[PDB]
């Protein structure tokens, strides 16, 4: 019988008690990255994260940081491989920058051979060290040209441009890459990119944020989400019809959270909690498992919710071999009004829920996850049991899928000096406590989880935060980015992997 | 009788001997800037100078600098006005960033109202201080979307997108702006952007520079130059047909140089010198004055030189009310082979000339202009008489045009400390020696020159050089960009203007 801790102090950093041998022999352990966050702009065209961070520097991070140079994995990809080799990792998730291989967006405009060569060399280097690549086609970095031609995922033109990009990736890299992710965190671009305008491309209703160049936060999230699902599904169909000889697997990436009632004896909070599951997870998992959006979304969102045709429904339903599930934290849910006629209405209001990290009796859900220095009542707290609850829910609700945990990690402040930054015991605690619950759910609930990739390989540009936080298991000096030095967490993870 | 110095030491920094009163009462004196170089990316979309500097950081400058934040004239435009007011300047040349007012490139995709407001406030502030705006529509910063959709000026689609952009500018700003420049330095994008790939977008033949993503240095410069002329001419026709009520004037910007024979008794060097005038100046001025390219270009370039239809010829011929002439330096010319079958052939080779700053007897043409620390035999030297020779030539060869000198200036090294940087006596010498010759040519040759704008108002991002050189008449601290402090040159220029 497995017992796992939910509160500080944690004792799962002892590899005598928790290590890779606790999991099945074939289980993959590694780390993750994304292209905007690590590569730099050298050698690629411009994408909407370049555009957004440059047009709206205060939205890029408090330091106005961006991905222009970052950790320079364009130059230092071998050093990334070296970290993975030091870890004895068996997996690495990275993304392909669309703008590096097709700078002009549309494949018929030509490819960048040198960009293709960059990923060939990375892939070959990984495989030579026994590391399985997990490759994200689209980690938010849409070529700027496509956003300017037709507003990107706002328009159905995205589907064929994404398909042709993906086809090039399968053609060039699929002989070696056997695990593909289509779109990173399906929920995020619709809501943050087109709802709150916290993320690229930065569209919203005028009264939500007067700096947005255009948008409608009530309608566009739904349009974009719908196009994401269709573009994803078209790529999965292309993969499974035209690249079956490659013997690989493909799936989407979800951001997952668990949700608990703010007041577990209040029917209204219980209802809000179940609505959140539907609106947060079901928005995408309903289509992916059934070809339809959840009924509560149909009912609430009404004419703002697009319909799938019968052909589209069939294309989207079942459009995965596995799910990449990202998991960071859990929220309490309580009811909230949905003012659909307000000029500041957002899609996110349609769930009719307010989310907190403290429940009605004043209980904080778990240890600190992210401090918010401008408003401490907005601090985020984590909840290790949430990974158990999410995986159990996916198994039970969503037809026992094959799952890889494609991100899980925690930040430390960029204000810490290097010695403090390397002494990242809070990261060991977060990672181990989640791994304990992941082992527990696999054993107790028989969830088909076959790997775990911690966020992040190394310090990088963090969307929305610049270089003001660090997520890496290895440390990068922003004054001299060449080295990636394993932190205490990376050293712990090395021991966990090879105990 | 006016006597002007050609060699150090110069004594024209004495405003007792040379000042604004030496020129006609109406003559405009000011300074110049461009949008990529000064504004920053905040509040605008991405353009090909963002793309180029980010994809090819070693081509942005030795420091890998770029226009992301620069002097932040987005925030500090009032401080630019303040410099101009301190100078008692009567003119200011600035550019509109296309990506700030139409981030999606094509006008039908929507405009950025806040971008429009930015230029309205600048323009209104200038006029309130008695400063005449000279506004460049296109200072190289093409929206990235257009380059990615159709490769920008490589394709005739540029013409209508440029026209619709210009129409928006005339509509929004032409009630106040009475001097418009279409395209900055017509020669530069074809040759550097599409020939040598030193400049955005960075296209060339594969053996010219293997880093180029695509291109053909032998053909594309000509295509791009042809489209520039057509796009320019379509905008001038639009202006003069639809905006005549505004009572303003429009013209192109030329980069001018003079050319002297490397050996003034050698017929081959004399011939190369005359070819250079045709290939450098006539490439554009032939079309602008006659609707045809120079015969030597027709003959040499052959099938690589596009033809104008009779309608196009008529549109381009006479498509200016004035010329903005930029002038920095003069070169000696000697013959050079034109290897049209070589895989590394460039359009620039078609002139059949090699350019130097030292003549056959070892004479350097004038004082140092720009030191090249990697190769000192590649140092640039200036030649004050060249402004006289250029203006005389334009009057005689090109039908006595109205001229404004739209740039003239010199750099100092970014390695200098602030006190050295503010003690910019080399800049006084360059500016005064050229102003002396400009007065001389107006008086002696009756060239219709009606203003002079020195490059640059303040230190900025220099194309190709990052922040490794400074051109400003006012100093900017890159650690805190708010202030623009007049250098010795700016203080001199203040006295020259109001002696
Ligand atoms: C998994 O996918 C299944 C589909 O493959 C989902 O089942 C569908 O659920 C639909 C409701 O979401 C349901 O459709 C309703 O059908 C009513 C019956 O119509 C038939 O008989 C009519 C009925 O009197 C007639 O007009 C129709 O022409 C048919 O003959 C119908 O009125 C409904 O329309 C009203 O409600 C929708 C909102 O739900 C409004 O958008 C619409 O304007 C109208 O106001 C609805 O019809 C659907 O209307 C929209 C139109 O685009 C669709 O094509 C039309 O179908 C449908 O019958 C079933 N299909 C079957 C095969 O069962 C299933 O939903 C879950 O299970 C069903 C039983 C129900 O409990 C749902 O609430 C659950 O979500 C999906 N499962 C999951 C887990 O999501
Ligand atoms: C200012 O613009 C003026 C035009 O408005 C320029 O004058 C034109 O100069 C053209 C040469 O560049 C000249 O065209 C040549 O015409 C030859 C005569 O053709 C007529 O009689 C024929 C002759 O036997 C017959 O086939 C034609 O159908 C006509 O009836 C002719 O062969 C020439 O073609 C050969 O040379 C061109 C290269 O120059 C090759 O491209 C072509 O394949 C061929 O090998 C040339 O014809 C032009 O051919 C190209 C085609 O696209 C053009 O439409 C065709 O016209 C033309 O006659 C005159 N036009 C007039 C009205 O004078 C003027 O040029 C300068 O002055 C002229 C006198 C000459 O000295 C030029 O070298 C100078 O540049 C321009 N001025 C300046 C300063 O540039
Ligand atoms: C978790 O949710 C539960 C369920 O909602 C909360 O308990 C409910 O709390 C209500 C007060 O917020 C209680 O109603 C009140 O009852 C007193 C005594 O009769 C009365 O004077 C009030 O006016 C009020 O009555 C309601 O007024 C509004 C009418 O529309 C409605 O019909 C009336 O019910 C309610 O009885 C209680 N329900 C239960 C089943 O206990 C619970 O609140 C926490 O516990 C209750 C017992 C009370 O001590 C609250 O102070 C305390 O906050 C909530 N838990 C937390 C931690 O918020
Ligand atoms: C400025 O250009 C002028 C004109 O080209 C240069 O003068 C010419 O310089 C040529 C040498 O580069 C002289 O030709 C040579 O004459 C000597 C004496 O006969 C002879 O032994 C050589 O072989 C050579 O003759 C040529 O060989 C190649 C044959 O195809 C050709 O037919 C022969 O001419 C040439 O006479 C001279 N022309 C004139 C009109 O003087 C001039 O060069 C400079 O001055 C000359 C006089 C000489 O002192 C050169 O050393 C010196 O460089 C050049 N000025 C500069 C500074 O480069
Ligand atoms: C978001 O787009 C929706 C749909 O176009 C706009 O909502 C509508 O508003 C028009 C004008 O009021 C209404 O007549 C419709 O009844 C509404 N339709 C629905 C589906 O709600 C909403 O004004 C736009 N919001 C913003 C801020 O522009
Ligand atoms: C807030 O969260 C706390 C902690 O999960 C809940 O408290 C638990 O309540 C259960 C059922 O009453 C008790 O058995 C436990 O002993 C309590 N745990 C502790 C740490 O207090 C609490 O019920 C939640 N409040 C609401 C209103 O939902
Ligand atoms: C530049 O484009 C020119 C024109 O397409 C290419 O030049 C031609 O080369 C083809 C193949 O040799 C030739 O048959 C033609 O005779 C040439 N045409 C002319 C007008 O010169 C040139 O190969 C291309 N250069 C590069 C590096 O791709
Ligand atoms: C190189 O440039 C120098 C300077 O312009 C030329 O020298 C002048 O030559 C003229 C005509 O012979 C003499 O009258 C001057 O006195 C010379 N000036 C000085 C400063 O020497 C020289 O002729 C040029 N060389 C060539 C080969 O063209
Ligand atoms: C691995 O952890 C298991 C408990 O899951 C433990 O029994 C085993 O001895 C540990 N391995 C090492 C080498 O410490
Ligand atoms: C940040 O930038 C936007 C312009 O993009 C401006 O609207 C907003 O006021 C600025 N935010 C703060 C908090 O200053
Ligand atoms: C598959 O490849 C063939 C060859 O390009 C193409 O005809 C077919 O449409 C593609 N298939 C998809 C997505 O099924
Ligand atoms: C607009 O929304 C903000 C945040 O969503 C809220 O605090 C404010 O009350 C809203 N105003 C109206 C008019 O509803
Ligand atoms: C930068 O870091 C690398 C790796 O530690 C080191 O070899 C190189 O010398 C350092 N550069 C400077 C300028 O210190
Ligand atoms: C790498 O992991 C394999 C598999 O568990 C193990 O056999 C090998 O010893 C490990 N190597 C190192 C250096 O830890
Ligand atoms: C201006 O320069 C002229 C010579 O061009 C001179 O005569 C005049 O006195 C100077 N003005 C002043 C105020 O020094
Ligand atoms: C600069 O960058 C390019 C890649 O864009 C590379 O091809 C070239 O070798 C580098 N230049 C130098 C001098 O290192
Ligand atoms: C002028 O404006 C009118 C109204 O848009 C348009 O019909 C006409 O084509 C434009 N003219 C140009 C470039 O001449
Ligand atoms: C190619 O050109 C470079 C510079 O243009 C030159 O130095 C080299 O000799 C040329 N090579 C050939 C094959 O002509
Ligand atoms: C930056 O420069 C401005 C103008 O001199 C000054 O007022 C401001 O205090 C300076 N900021 C810092 C942080 O020194
Ligand atoms: C501004 O220039 C005008 C025109 O020459 C002159 O009358 C006025 O005195 C000058 N002002 C200053 C402060 O120099
Ligand atoms: Zn940047």
UniProtKB/Swiss-Prot annotation, chains A, B:
It is found in: Vacuole. Its main location: other. Its EC number is 3.2.1.147. Pfam families: Glyco_hydro_1. Zn(2+) binds at residues 54, 68. Substrate binds at residues 37, 139, 184, 328, 455, 462-463. In vacuoles called myrosin grains of a certain class of cells, myrosin cells, distributed in the cotyledons and the axis of the embryo as well as in different organs of the growing plant. It seems that the absence of a catalytic proton donor in plant myrosinases is not impairing the hydrolysis of glucosinolates. This is Myrosinase MA1. It comes from Sinapis alba (White mustard). The lineage of its organism: Eukaryota, Viridiplantae, Streptophyta, Embryophyta, Tracheophyta.
